[PDB]
Amino acid sequence: HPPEIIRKPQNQGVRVGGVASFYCAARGDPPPSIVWRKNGKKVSGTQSRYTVLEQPGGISILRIEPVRAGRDDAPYECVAENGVGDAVSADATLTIYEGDKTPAGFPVITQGPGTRVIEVGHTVLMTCKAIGNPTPNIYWIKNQTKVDMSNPRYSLKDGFLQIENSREEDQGKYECVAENSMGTEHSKATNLYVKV
């Protein structure tokens, strides 16, 4: 059976020097593989600044950082192939904004997470203060992948990430992402250290 894309990548508008990422998810029988194309050519995670992350659920993420004007702004494609003769694809473009040429209402992170040390068993609240029009959605990434918010110790409070009863496992490099219809901004990433 032909594969189907259950989550299409979305156009991204990002500031020069920032982080861009596209998400794609596909499934099928036989199970499909996902590849990313840029200007019609395969993208390889072997090249610097480009990273391809796979996760269970048929998920592939293309992450680019830092983005360079003239180099990374292009139409991309997610292509899901089953290896037996069928493929499907979905397009998404990366638009890069230099200087103050951002769309009006583009998300601004006025305070991102800062370097923090927390004692085991203590609660930490990581700040992400962002503004935009529309009001931005906020989500959290640790070590390049979305934080699993189904963890009962993790929750969002007005966009801030709360980790209760911290464990050594929680340590890592966190960033928040502020997104709306006008663009996407990643905060600088910072270390959470858990002191035992």
Query: Distance (Å, rounded) from C-alpha 169 to C-alpha 156?
Result: 19
* Best CA proximity match to 18, nearest among 66, 70, 71: 66
Q: What is the DSSP pairing of strand 129-131 with strand 108-111?
A: antiparallel
Dihedral of CA atoms 7, 181, 126, 121 in degrees, nearest 10, equals -30
Q: What is the CA radius of gyration of the chain?
A: 18
| Token code pair at residue 52 | 């391809």
Q: Which residues does the annotation place in the binding site for heparin? A: 37-49
Q: Which residues does the annotation place in the binding site? A: 37-49
Domains and CATH numbers, the chain: 1-99 (2.60.40.10), 100-196 (2.60.40.10)
Which residues have a Cβ under 8 Å from the Cβ of 85 and sit 6 or more positions away? none
Question: What's the resolution in A?
Answer: 1.8
Instruction: Find out whether 100 and 76 touch, Cβ atoms under 8 Å.
Output: no
Count of beta carbons in the 10 Å neighbourhood of residue 185? 23
Query: Distance (Å, rounded) from C-alpha 47 to C-alpha 53?
Result: 14
Query: Distance (Å, rounded) from C-alpha 66 to C-alpha 174?
Result: 16
How was this structure determined? It was done by X-ray
Query: Distance (Å, rounded) from C-alpha 162 to C-alpha 139?
Result: 12
